[PDB]
RNA sequence: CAGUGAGCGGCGAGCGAAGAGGGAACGAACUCGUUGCCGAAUCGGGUCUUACAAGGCCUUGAGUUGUGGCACGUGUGGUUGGUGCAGGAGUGGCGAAAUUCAAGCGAAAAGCAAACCCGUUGCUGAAUACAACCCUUCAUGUGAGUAUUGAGCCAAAGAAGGUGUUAGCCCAUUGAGCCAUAAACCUGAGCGCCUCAUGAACAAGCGAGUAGCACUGUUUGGGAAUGCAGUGUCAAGUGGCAGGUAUUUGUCUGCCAAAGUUAAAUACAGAGUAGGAAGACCGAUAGCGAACAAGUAGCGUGAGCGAAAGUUUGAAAAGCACUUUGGAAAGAGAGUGAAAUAGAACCUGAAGUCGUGACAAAGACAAUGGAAGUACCUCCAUUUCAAC
RNA sequence: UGGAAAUGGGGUGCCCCCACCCGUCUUGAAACACGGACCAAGGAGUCAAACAGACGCGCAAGGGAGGAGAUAUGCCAGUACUUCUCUCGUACUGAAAGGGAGAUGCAAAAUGCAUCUGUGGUGUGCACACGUCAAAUCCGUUUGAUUUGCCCAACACC
RNA sequence: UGCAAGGCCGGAAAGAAAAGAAUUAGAGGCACCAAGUGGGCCUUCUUCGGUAAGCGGAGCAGGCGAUGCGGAAUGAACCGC
RNA sequence: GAUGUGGCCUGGAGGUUAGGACGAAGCUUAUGGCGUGAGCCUAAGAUGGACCGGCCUCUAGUGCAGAUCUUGGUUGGCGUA
RNA sequence: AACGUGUCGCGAUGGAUGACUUGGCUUCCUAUUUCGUUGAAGAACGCAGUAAAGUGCGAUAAGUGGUAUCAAUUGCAGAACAUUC
RNA sequence: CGUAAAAGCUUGCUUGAUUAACGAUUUCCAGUACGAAUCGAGACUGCGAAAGCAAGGCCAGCGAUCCUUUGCGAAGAAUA
């Protein structure tokens, strides 16, 4: 008999199993720990090779899209030319001192632009630049003692000089206002929703 | 909580005292245990009769 | 483990529990969900009512992120308030502030009796929830 | 003990007077024929015992 | 995300993705055409500078039916070319400790003193052995100590291989360290000289049989048509393309097709070269067809098909000298070896079948089988043998 | 104290009695139904994925990853550690636009008002508490019934 | 202040007498998961078709199938068990 | 046909406890003893020559009398046609 | 009687079992890692004192040259810088 | 099978052969569906002086998914 079971949909009707007549189509993960070890070793070797430069370049802070991830923050691809100009940097020059540049991002508001300019200013304040010729030092380049006293940043996301992404702070406890105690907010929200929901029909009825 | 293992504490025991023999032989239990009664005498070596007539 | 299976118990029985008469053949009733309307109709009708047919309108390119909208009830609000702040909270005084969208909720529903008054910031709210919280002494402020 | 999902699933959902839940992973699949009067027939919600 | 409250489907069987989020990687970006300003400043070939120089000189040879350049006084270049000089990595050789310590042979080169301590001490022997029905006489027999016991050393090395039995100290291996190097690789973009380059002083436009549309065909989850192909038709001008239900008309958002190059994170589902590391896998009818002169021997006109088979004697050939019977093969003696019951494709040597000796008997009930006795036997077990 | 006796096993023959050839399909096999000369080695319910039920274990209105990283870690394909996030669940319903669940009291407002130690009601319902009646009793107490209160889990009707 | 319905309060109750005046190897109810089977045949009483059949088709019950043992010399189903 | 078993047996793994050149595995049996049974243990070898037993967990290519079953060997017919 | 049957001791035929394993299968890693008209892969014929197959090699033919090492190779011949010819 | 001042015959007036908030049930039966049938509540009606009777002609006369096709979401009004 069959009885009461779920109706099955297991999707295994193609030649996926390797047998005496089929090559198969499979993927196993038996090399996962070895690959993890290899990646860590490569990162360590690359850090040794590029010492004393930080292993990861500097990146900006952006807001995630859609209404589901509106409240989250993360790292973007690169800094915008408007932000670089506000901080006082040529993009081509900035590309040579470990700053990522992205010419596509738009900067549609002032808050994100200000936060990115602050990140850039902090990085430039903390930067130490080696001279091309130590016998003839120029402006903006470090001295022999500063060059000797140098360390490497091996953080996963870089940002060892600017910190992690900043989230807005929480509100402190307060007391209810008279307006908040009197007014009904459901009516306000529903009226605003209906104003957009019934815009076309209301306009057409008016045009009569 | 542990400083290394975040939010970990030792599990709570199911029994406060694991010596149940002491509990079973304590005076408090013996006060409420049922009394021991006298039993019938053990059967003798001779076979008992079963024929009424 | 192979040592716990019925094969180990059935070594020597010659039929392995499939009978002498019916026997164990390959596919005695078709493969998969075959015959759902012809010779498996009783099973399909009594255990899976509503398997066949069409219903409703179509939505071609569905995106779930714009539809994201989780809810939380009025009597569950203490899950988002710290113990000390909850202890120091009474009607007429200072109340803790709860931000729903930072905790993963969008709408506030009004089931049950509220335990501790507070100020709730939410995207959506229901009539009963708004009325009950205002009567209890808290407040709701809209956010986006 | 009542109120468990297994208890809610026990029984056949296609007989008159039954309100058990079917075993299905896709919530929108098992509608239509046998659950709406417009699609052939509808399972009766009540039956005298 | 997602076997999806998307979607496709005799809406049956079945099929079936994308944006967002956490991550890997990432010094990641550049070149033509067109427009504007120049107009051979370009390329190839000879010849000379240590030089087929990104160099000088000469060339109608190519090229104006368009190569190429520029915008959208202190320094530098080891990726201009010619000459030289270092260190490192890599590669190849060389390179470590401690007992063949003492006890001798069939039976003490074995034990007991019941957690630990006594114990760097006490006490010994049911092997006067065995060798085929029993008893006397004479013979014959025990391979190699990595075993046992008692003492003693090495360890930054206890790690597995070899050696006639089971080895930290019999042998090999492994560490610090030493020596030698075509080019290439790494090092204030290592460091000098000549030559050569160079940072830095003094406005209009934007890729045409293309995109699109009609018919037909195929493909896709893509549904009044996701991508593509054939034919017909065939554009616009900062206007165009995309916003997952067709049309017309208004807004809004993103982007600018019809030219090109580009590392890493990913594959190696019957590849190859040079090196390595392993396994709760198989153990010679197994594991690759092939542990072996295996894609071999052999088969087929041919395309193709394709085995069986561990040479595993012994520690070491010490591989049976010599006598004798036989034409020979071989037999009977003798000898080597701990064993020949290890004698050559020789470790062990089962089942089935057969020969021989001794014994049990037995009609014709096919034979086999059960239950209960008895006759005869028994290299088997246990018990008893004295007021027991 | 023996080449001993005795009692159990083991072997072969004999007597009286009993007794159709195994495996299989089949209503029915011993059959004039099929497969069956002997021995050795080999020989058949497995692995993966989706779901459900019973049982074991951890946590609990919360449970848990996965991928990846970090350093003990440079012997070690293991173990130890980690954030956001993601997923199942705490709420369902409609084709959809959408909406969204406490109790009591006063009352009857087209979002009524007030309190917050609380099973929405009724019937049947472990244990516990208060009494009573039987039978037995080693006189300390036991074993059964029943009254009343609250009724846990659960069932039925609202 | 009659009938119908849902409740509350109180009483009575050989817990069911006597006349042949029941009995019980008499614990009731409720679920979850799953196998084999879905060719039958025989007999007793009642039968339908057929000349009839060790023939075909049904009703009630008991059996063989799935089961030996003791009897009818021998027999799946008869008698006893 | 279902289920249970401090139920039996085989190859390997994590632990623990033993054995062996004064003779391991394998092989032979009128070698008995134990268990209802699957099986376990001892004796003898006038056999062999180097490994291996018990117990608790883990694991699987884990138990043969027949498939006109596979491979190897043997065999009556037969000193016959 | 003979043939034949049964049990035990010994012996044949046969090649199972056990122990052994320079083989197979499977899983990982490293890099100055990828042939050919400057004639490849594959096919043929030859080469040793003695040499059928196989292995190596090409009329310089079981091999010439260079560096390292340090006394053999071996069935039997044969030869005989060790300062490393 | 049932029926006699009718359930038959004649005649008069009519459209209960309409709608009927997803009420319950019988027959087949797995206590599924389809077909047929029974007891009801609401609207608007017909006949009758009235109590009442009637949502076809009692009991056979009929049909899933997908697809095609028809009918109801009349005009007016909400500061939502
Ligand atoms: K140079
Ligand atoms: Mg069935
Ligand atoms: Mg079964
Ligand atoms: Mg079947
Ligand atoms: Mg619930
Ligand atoms: Mg899911
Ligand atoms: Mg497809
Ligand atoms: Mg130009
Ligand atoms: Mg040009
Ligand atoms: Mg010595
Ligand atoms: Mg060793
Ligand atoms: Mg363009
Ligand atoms: Mg075209
Ligand atoms: Mg297709
Ligand atoms: Mg390309
Ligand atoms: Mg073989
Ligand atoms: Mg083989
Ligand atoms: Mg031997
Ligand atoms: Mg031999
Ligand atoms: Mg034999
Ligand atoms: Mg018989
Ligand atoms: Mg038949
Ligand atoms: Mg038979
Ligand atoms: Mg016959
Ligand atoms: Mg047949
Ligand atoms: Mg969570
Ligand atoms: Mg955060
Ligand atoms: Mg739920
Ligand atoms: Mg919804
Ligand atoms: Mg609706
Ligand atoms: Mg009476
Ligand atoms: Mg059948
Ligand atoms: Mg018949
Ligand atoms: Mg049968
Ligand atoms: Mg009987
Ligand atoms: Mg007779
Ligand atoms: Mg195995
Ligand atoms: Mg025998
Ligand atoms: Mg097998
Ligand atoms: Mg066999
Ligand atoms: Mg030549
Ligand atoms: Mg209904
Ligand atoms: Mg109907
Ligand atoms: Mg009516
Ligand atoms: Mg129809
Ligand atoms: Mg209207
Ligand atoms: Na099946
Ligand atoms: Na040695």
Q: Phi and psi at residue D41, in whole multiples of 5°?
A: -155, 170
A186: closest CA among A198, A178, A194, A175? Answer: A194
> How far from the centroid of its chain's Cα atoms is residue D5's Cα?
14
CA–centroid distance, C123 to ligand 30, in Å, is 26
CA–centroid distance, C3 to ligand 39, in Å, is 14
Q: Phi and psi at residue A61, in whole multiples of 5°?
A: -115, 130
> How far from the centroid of its chain's Cα atoms is residue A45's Cα?
26
- The answer to whether the beta carbon of residue A206 comes closer than 7 angstroms to any atom of strand E is no
Contacts of D24 in chain A (CB under 8 A): 6-7
- The answer, for C52 touching chain D at a CB cutoff of 8 Å, is yes
Q: Do C49 and D13 touch (CB under 8 A)?
A: yes
| CA–CA distances in Å: residue A63 to residues A86, C69, C94, C143 | 20, 20, 33, 17
Which residue of D13, D33, D43 is in closest CB contact with C52?
A: D33
Alpha carbon of A52: minimum distance to chain C alpha carbons (Å): 39
Residues A78 and A120: their CA atoms lie apart, in Å, by: 11
Q: Phi and psi at residue D26, in whole multiples of 5°?
A: -100, 110
| Chain C nearest-CA residue for A181 | C134
Q: Binding residue per annotation — A132? A: yes
DSSP string, A38-74: HHHHHHHHHHHHHTTS-SS-B--EEE--TTTSTT-EE
DSSP A99: B
Q: Is B42 helix (H, G, I), strand (E, B) or coil?
A: coil
Which residue of A67, A68, A175 is in closest CB contact with C93?
A: A175
Nucleotide E170 C1' to residue C133 CA (A): 94
Q: Which nucleotide is nearest to D34 (CA to C1')?
A: J33
Residues A127 and A161: their CA atoms lie apart, in Å, by: 9
- What per-residue string of b and e applies to B17-46 under the rule 16 or more CB within 10 Å gives b? eeeeeeeeeeeeeeeeeeeeeeeeeeeeee
C-beta of residue C105 within 8 angstroms of C-beta of residue C122: yes
Between residue 21 and residue 40 of chain C, the positions with Cβ below 7 Å from nucleic chain G are: 21-23
The two structure tokens encoding residue A110: 């002032």
Residue B12 CA neighbour count, 13 Å, CB half? 2
The two structure tokens encoding residue D17: 């007077």
Residues A74 and A60: their CA atoms lie apart, in Å, by: 8
Contacts of D25 in chain A (CB under 8 A): 6
The two structure tokens encoding residue A187: 């009516």
- The answer, for C17 touching chain D at a CB cutoff of 8 Å, is no
**Preceding peptide of A83 cis, ω within 30°:** no
Nucleotide E274 C1' to residue A38 CA (A): 21
Residues B22 and C135: their CA atoms lie apart, in Å, by: 59
Question: What contacts A70, CB < 8 A, 6 or more positions away?
Answer: A63, A64, C101
Torsion angle of alpha carbons A192, A195, A197, A200, nearest 10°?
-170
C-beta of residue C101 within 8 angstroms of C-beta of residue A168: no
C-beta of residue A116 within 8 angstroms of C-beta of residue A80: yes
Nucleotide E153 C1' to residue A85 CA (A): 79
- The answer, for C82 touching chain A at a CB cutoff of 8 Å, is no
Question: Subunits that touch chain A (at least 3 Cβ pairs < 8 angstroms)?
Answer: C, D
* Resolution (Å) of this entry: 2.4
Question: What contacts C84, CB < 8 A, 6 or more positions away?
Answer: none
Q: Phi and psi at residue A63, in whole multiples of 5°?
A: -105, 140
From the number of C-beta atoms within 10 Å of its C-beta (0-12, 13-18, 19+), residue C92 rates as exposed
Q: How many helices (H) and strands (E) does chain C have?
A: 5, 6
Residues C2 and A12: their CA atoms lie apart, in Å, by: 25
Residues A43 and D31: their CA atoms lie apart, in Å, by: 55
From the number of C-beta atoms within 10 Å of its C-beta (0-12, 13-18, 19+), residue C130 rates as buried
DSSP string, C55-79: -S---SS--SGGG---EE-GGGGGG
Question: What contacts A134, CB < 8 A, 6 or more positions away?
Answer: A144, A147
Q: Do A7 and C33 touch (CB under 8 A)?
A: yes
Beta strands in chain A (DSSP E): 61-63, 73-75
Q: How many helices (H) and strands (E) does chain D have?
A: 1, 0
* Helices (H), ranges, chain A: 32-50, 81-87, 91-94, 110-126, 144-148, 178-182, 185-197, 199-206
Residues C3 and C44: their CA atoms lie apart, in Å, by: 37
């Amino acid at each position: 008999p069959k009885g009461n079971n779920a109706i099955p949909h297991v999707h295994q009707k193609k030649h996926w199993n390797p047998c005496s007549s089929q090559k198969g189509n499979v993927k196993v993960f038996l090399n996962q720990p070895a690959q993890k070890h290899r990646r860590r070793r490569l990162r360590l070797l690359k850090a040794k090779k590029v010492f004393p430069r930080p292993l990861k370049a500097l990146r900006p802070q952006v807001n995630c899209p859609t209404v589901r991830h509106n409240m989250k923050r993360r790292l973007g691809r690169g800094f915008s030319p408007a932000e670089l100009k506000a901080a006082g940097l040529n993009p081509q020059y900035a590309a040579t001192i470990g700053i990522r540049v992205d010419s596509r991002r738009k900067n549609k508001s002032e808050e994100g632009m200000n936060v990115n300019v602050q990140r850039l200013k902090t990085y430039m304040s903390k930067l130490v630049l080696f001279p091309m010729n130590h016998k003839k030092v120029q402006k903006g380049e470090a001295s022999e003692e500063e060059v000797k006293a140098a360390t490497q940043d091996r953080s996963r996301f870089g940002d060892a000089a600017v910190g992690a992404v900043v989230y807005p702070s929480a509100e402190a406890p307060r007391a209810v206002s008279a307006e908040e105690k009197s007014m009904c907010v459901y009516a306000f929200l529903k009226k605003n929703h209906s104003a957009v929901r019934f815009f076309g029909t209301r306009s057409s009825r008016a045009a009569r | 909580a542990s400083a290394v293992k975040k939010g970990f504490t030792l599990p709570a025991p199911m029994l406060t005292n694991t010596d149940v023999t002491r509990i079973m032989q304590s005076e408090e239990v013996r006060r409420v245990l049922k009394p021991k009664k006298l039993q019938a005498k053990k059967a003798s070596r001779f076979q008992t009769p079963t024929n009424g007539m | 483990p192979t040592r716990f299976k019925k094969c180990r118990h059935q070594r020597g029985s010659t039929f392995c529990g499939y009978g002498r008469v019916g026997k164990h053949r390959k596919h005695e009733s078709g493969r998969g969900n075959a015959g759902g309307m012809h010779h498996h109709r009783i099973n399909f009708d009594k255990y899976h009512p509503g398997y066949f047919g069409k219903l409703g309108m179509d939505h071609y390119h569905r995106k779930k992120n714009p539809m994201w909208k989780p809810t939380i009830n009025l009597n569950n609000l203490s899950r988002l308030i710290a113990a000390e702040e909850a202890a120091k909270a009474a009607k007429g005084g200072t109340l803790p502030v709860v931000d729903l969208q930072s905790s993963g909720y969008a709408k506030l529903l009004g089931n049950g009796h509220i335990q501790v008054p507070c100020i709730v910031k939410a995207r959506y709210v229901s009539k009963l929830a708004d009325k009950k919280i205002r009567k209890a002494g808290g407040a709701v402020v809209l956010q986006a | 003990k009542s109120g468990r999902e297994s208890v809610r699933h026990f029984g056949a959902s296609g007989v008159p007077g039954s309100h058990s839940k079917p075993y299905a992973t896709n919530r929108g699949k098992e509608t239509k024929r046998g659950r709406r009067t417009g699609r052939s027939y509808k399972r009766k919600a009540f039956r005298h015992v």
